[PDB]
Design an enzyme around this catalytic site. Structure first.
Site, PDB file in Angstrom:
ATOM      1  N   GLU A  22      23.265 -29.134 -13.693  1.00 40.25           N
ATOM      2  CA  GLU A  22      23.411 -29.220 -15.278  1.00 40.25           C
ATOM      3  C   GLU A  22      24.434 -30.482 -15.359  1.00 40.25           C
ATOM      4  O   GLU A  22      25.682 -30.477 -14.740  1.00 40.25           O
ATOM      5  CB  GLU A  22      23.853 -28.004 -15.755  1.00 40.25           C
ATOM      6  CG  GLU A  22      22.924 -26.968 -15.699  1.00 40.25           C
ATOM      7  CD  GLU A  22      21.703 -27.298 -16.741  1.00 40.25           C
ATOM      8  OE1 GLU A  22      21.623 -28.226 -17.532  1.00 40.25           O
ATOM      9  OE2 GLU A  22      20.652 -26.515 -16.324  1.00 40.25           O
ATOM     10  N   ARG A  73      19.635 -15.464 -28.462  1.00 41.89           N
ATOM     11  CA  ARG A  73      18.499 -14.783 -29.189  1.00 41.89           C
ATOM     12  C   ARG A  73      18.290 -13.531 -28.873  1.00 41.89           C
ATOM     13  O   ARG A  73      17.967 -12.724 -29.771  1.00 41.89           O
ATOM     14  CB  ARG A  73      17.209 -15.725 -28.931  1.00 41.89           C
ATOM     15  CG  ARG A  73      16.904 -16.171 -27.277  1.00 41.89           C
ATOM     16  CD  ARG A  73      15.830 -16.695 -27.052  1.00 41.89           C
ATOM     17  NE  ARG A  73      14.582 -15.723 -27.799  1.00 41.89           N
ATOM     18  CZ  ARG A  73      14.248 -14.787 -26.995  1.00 41.89           C
ATOM     19  NH1 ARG A  73      14.422 -14.520 -25.751  1.00 41.89           N
ATOM     20  NH2 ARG A  73      13.170 -13.816 -27.763  1.00 41.89           N
ATOM     21  N   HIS A  94      21.226 -24.454 -12.092  1.00 44.89           N
ATOM     22  CA  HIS A  94      20.431 -23.485 -12.484  1.00 44.89           C
ATOM     23  C   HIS A  94      19.310 -23.351 -11.578  1.00 44.89           C
ATOM     24  O   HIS A  94      18.910 -24.430 -10.914  1.00 44.89           O
ATOM     25  CB  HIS A  94      19.797 -23.695 -13.729  1.00 44.89           C
ATOM     26  CG  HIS A  94      20.358 -22.944 -15.086  1.00 44.89           C
ATOM     27  ND1 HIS A  94      20.694 -23.671 -16.382  1.00 44.89           N
ATOM     28  CD2 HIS A  94      20.520 -21.693 -15.289  1.00 44.89           C
ATOM     29  CE1 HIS A  94      20.869 -22.701 -17.319  1.00 44.89           C
ATOM     30  NE2 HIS A  94      20.924 -21.700 -16.675  1.00 44.89           N
ATOM     31  N   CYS A 120      24.744 -18.568 -19.530  1.00 44.74           N
ATOM     32  CA  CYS A 120      24.839 -19.412 -18.437  1.00 44.74           C
ATOM     33  C   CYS A 120      25.689 -20.497 -18.844  1.00 44.74           C
ATOM     34  O   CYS A 120      26.656 -21.180 -18.292  1.00 44.74           O
ATOM     35  CB  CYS A 120      23.558 -19.950 -17.554  1.00 44.74           C
ATOM     36  SG  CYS A 120      22.715 -18.567 -16.880  1.00 44.74           S
TER      37      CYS A 120
END
Lengths: 206, 206, 207, 209
Positions: A80, A90, A167, A143
């Site tokens: 990343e 969510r 990831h 994460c």
């Protein structure tokens, strides 16, 4: 010799396995190239994940830190590039926290760039026949939260450390009931080992 | 002891490797349970592929035949339910043939069903932790052509033979430049071996 | 003049709308060139859908039949090349039937090819700026059931009819909770009208 | 309170002959709806120059709100962007041949800027009209992100009263005739942007959902 701390997450509900941990656990105590690797597990929980990470840092005094998490649906190992200052969940984490529109660090920067040589990492993984690519969003769940907190803690308290986040896809065994891309646990493990060696061998990215 | 013939295709359209052949090649000569396996390669060429299959059948006198081909983009091992009577090529085969709107067999049926117990196969493959599902279209290129030709041969000349087709995904090393799902060559090989053993052990599907 | 019967399914699964019926409902009574269109709704129910189509066939005595259905996840208008003799339901139909491994016609052929000039249809649709492609599987749910039943009915009892099936994507209002591709109802309706006119203008397909 | 809303769209790029971002905002030039008074300007798909053109449009219109729009081929929803990052990273050249790599948009500027638009509200109002929308957390690293970051940087340093942001939209159907790909009709896209402009004009503050 560079002490490389790898972290993987514990199981998230429904999943009985969290490959990020299964992969990094295999590398614990490994001496590869200039890297001396140690692995610690982190809870998939907002806030608490960061406290466990701080204790692992205190415990191992790493020179390099690579936090690993699962991004189901992806088809490549993906280091990343950037972490953002926001918890937008969510569904609840493992202890029921479901933050919405929340700053990770009140007054901290909107983002932190990774401190790892991710373009080199991506290329060395591909050189070994494993797909990889840079990602520009780590999401807004635990994460990214751990990624942002890692860089915030490095910047404010341990600037000598080179840290970042990577990831990984689902492993095949997680895709038996609904179809989705995966990479075998052996390949993901090998890719994280390559990332660790690469980071340990090079501070500078290409 | 059933003699199981597996086939895989030669490299095609830019690829340097064809995982359908690399995987079945590994099983040539293997004996497991009721299965005695033999493998032969087939050219990714319309008409000629069927000629090579007929010779393989003549030579080995198999009881069961599983033709294997690559379906780039899929994320599961996929045994095919139905073959259709049509050659419709959007790109040329390895010998420049690009049939359009062409019957595979003049006067043959619109389709042939597979003769393998594919639901059993899918379940046995998933029991081993590898994603699998039945597919209802084998395409209209050389793979469907070989599947239809196989069933038409079986229909025509050897009705006791149990035959069919299984598509497989890309292997990781074919997905380094453009992202796409893949399964490792070891997993594809294991899945095909399970398919062979399952077909040999059971005439009837579940 | 050619009479074109279009059919669309009612809502199924947990949907509250079905674009196949919404679009064909708009074309009832439309006429253009050699085509005059009539539309009928078919229930998303195995067996019962075929009886309803037979009733529409008797009522309207059409020259052309285009059965339309929803294929959520697709990104183009997709005329189907082939119908297969199998009911294999991943979810129950609207009355709870969930057949598995079932023949649609005992002893019928494994498959029936479409009787529509679908290559011409895909080209005429793309000419209007709407994506379209031939599909080689219409699934194993009620849509394929209807498509196979239609071609069986034609082959056995009304071979003069040119018939077939066209799947269409979700419409935008169906993709608000989970991201998925869609085509606007206006574009789907225009494509189906083009499909009717093309089929009515040519019995023969192109290559 | 009336609000002047400046919308921008890009010219065609990468082999395309139309860019739905400009085709859609062009239709809204001069539109008035609710408290929004809309003006539109085209921006070139070129690094550096795109920001200069944006600054000229800002001087010209003195907008209260700015919504820059770009095409995100492959997406299936209207997607207001939450965050802009300080990086030009081009996989292909822009319309004038520039292909920066690993380049800061603002040397020493912040790594990112948050949008100043009420994007949760905009997504909800678009979905209420039956059009898919969702918040995106990456605007890419090409000219669209470049424009988004430069806009938030200009607002931050020189006109902090302006509420600005970026919205990516899908391909329109006519751009997906050769390789399948998701799209939304130009009419729906134009309607979604109109809704975004009226919603931002009507509410300075975002909802939380």
């Amino acid at each position: 010799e560079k002490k490389v701390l790898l972290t993987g997450f514990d199981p998230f509900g429904g999943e009985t396995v969290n490959p990020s941990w299964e992969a990094v656990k295999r590398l614990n105590g490994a001496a590869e190239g200039p890297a001396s690797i140690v692995s610690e597990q982190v809870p998939t929980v907002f806030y608490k994940s960061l406290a466990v990470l701080r204790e692992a840092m205190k415990k191992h005094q790493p020179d390099i830190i690579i936090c690993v998490g699962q991004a189901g649906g992806r088809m490549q190992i993906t280091p990343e590039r950037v972490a953002i200052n926001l918890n937008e969940a969510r569904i609840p984490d493992n202890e029921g926290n479901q933050p919405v529109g929340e700053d990770i660090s009140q007054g901290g920067p909107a983002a932190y760039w990774t401190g790892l040589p991710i373009k080199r990492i991506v290329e060395e993984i591909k050189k070994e026949g494993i797909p990889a690519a840079v990602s520009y969003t780590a999401g807004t769940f635990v994460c990214n939260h751990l990624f942002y907190g890692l860089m915030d803690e490095i910047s404010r308290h341990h600037p000598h450390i080179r840290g970042g986040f990577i990831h990984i896809p689902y492993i095949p065994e997680q895709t038996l009931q609904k179809s989705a891309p995966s990479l075998s646990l052996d390949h993901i493990t090998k890719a994280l080992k390559i990332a660790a060696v690469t980071a340990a061998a090079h501070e500078d990215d290409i």
